Amino acid sequence: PLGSARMKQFKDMLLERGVSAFSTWEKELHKIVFDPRYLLLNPKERKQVFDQYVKTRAEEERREKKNKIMQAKEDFKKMMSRFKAIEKMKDREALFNEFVAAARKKEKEDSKTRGEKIKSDFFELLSNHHLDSQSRWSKVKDKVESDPRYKAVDSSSMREDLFKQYIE
Incomplete structure (x- = not known):
C-alpha cells in the first residue's frame, strides 16, 4: 500500500x-x-x-x-513424500538421528519425572493421613486403597516399602 x-x-x-x-x-x-x-x-x-x-x-x-x-524438517520430523523433500541421504540422516537420539533423550527424562512422581504422590497420599512410627501398614492400606496415587504404584510390596520409608 x-x-x-x-x-x-x-x-x-x-x-x-x-x-x-x-x-x-x-x-x-x-x-x-x-x-x-x-x-x-x-x-x-x-x-x-x-x-x-x-x-x-x-x-x-x-x-x-x-x-x-x-x-522441510517439521514435516520430515512429523512423518515420525515428506521423505523425498530432503536431498541426499547425508542430510536426511543427521536428522533421522536427530529425532531418535532425542526421543530416547526424552525418557532419561520422562521415566524419571514420572518416576519421582509416583513416589511423591504416594507420600502426598500418605500425608493426607495422620501417621507415625506406631502406624501399621495393615490398618493404613485400607484407608488409601481406592486412591489413584496408590494404584499407580504397581508393586504391592513396594507400596509397603515406601510406607516404611515414610514412617522411619
Whole structure:
C-alpha cells in the first residue's frame, strides 16, 4: 500500500525489469533508465522506492529460504513424500538421528519425572493421613486403597516399602 499511483508504477517497473536487491543503484540504473515510468519520479523519490524495494525483496528471499528449510524438517520430523523433500541421504540422516537420539533423550527424562512422581504422590497420599512410627501398614492400606496415587504404584510390596520409608 504505497502512497501514490505514480510510485506504484515505479515499484512495478523495478520488478518487471529484474533489478537486483544486491547491487548499487548506479549499476542497476541501466535496467530501468529507458523505461517511460522512470520519468515519473524525481531522484529523492526514485531513491525512496528503490531503497524500499531492495530492503523488502532481500528480506523476502532470506525468509523464503529459511521457512522452506524449517518447514522441510517439521514435516520430515512429523512423518515420525515428506521423505523425498530432503536431498541426499547425508542430510536426511543427521536428522533421522536427530529425532531418535532425542526421543530416547526424552525418557532419561520422562521415566524419571514420572518416576519421582509416583513416589511423591504416594507420600502426598500418605500425608493426607495422620501417621507415625506406631502406624501399621495393615490398618493404613485400607484407608488409601481406592486412591489413584496408590494404584499407580504397581508393586504391592513396594507400596509397603515406601510406607516404611515414610514412617522411619
